[PDB]
Amino acid sequence: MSPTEAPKVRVTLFCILVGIVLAMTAVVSDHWAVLSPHCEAAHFGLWRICTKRGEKNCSYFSISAAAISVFSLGFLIMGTICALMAFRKKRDYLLRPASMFYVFAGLCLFVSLEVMRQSVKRMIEYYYSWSFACACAAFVLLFLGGISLLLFSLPRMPQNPWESCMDAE
């Protein structure tokens, strides 16, 4: 009840539910590399890679950055299963490991950010107005909310010589 009915844990969990799609924005958007030779502009992503002159042409090809984000989706499933059943059946400990996978969700995203910065670093400018600031918001969401979700279900620093973490109720 008291870990799972509190307003600080339900504001937090819905804020998890927002940025779960912000990565899913970035998983099918291809926008956070803007090449500019001057035309030969390109629009890189995680699957699609799109050279525009109009003649919009998006295609495929840096395969490290895809496989990591499978576990940024594989954890993101497995993070949600525990969190869903942690409301029924009077289990509330289970809210703690679901916070773990959400941290390791965004940490797989931060990997795939920098690798698609290394698909830029070897490859004329770099510019972003959509994907970089959403995926480096989804990282900034998921890493920060799960840690907050983690702190809100661990009990407290005991403050007094009789209290103990894990004490009855």
């Binding site: 400990y93 289970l94 703690r96 490991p97 773990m100 390791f104 990997v111 661990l154 973490c165 894990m166």
Partner: protein
């Protein structure tokens, strides 16, 4: 790096069996021990 990671995994599967989950996530060193076992696996897989 792989050889130790399997061992501290296998202390964590055992410490799930004995306490049956509800009692494992009650002691907050084990919550930290769960955190280390996961990120140590991702150390192996992302390296290879």
């Amino acid at each position: 790096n792989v050889a130790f990671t399997i061992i501290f995994t296998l202390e964590m599967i055992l410490k799930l069996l004995a306490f049956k989950a509800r009692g494992y996530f009650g002691d907050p060193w084990n919550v930290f021990d769960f955190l280390i076992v996961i990120g140590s696996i991702i150390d192996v897989i992302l390296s290879e």
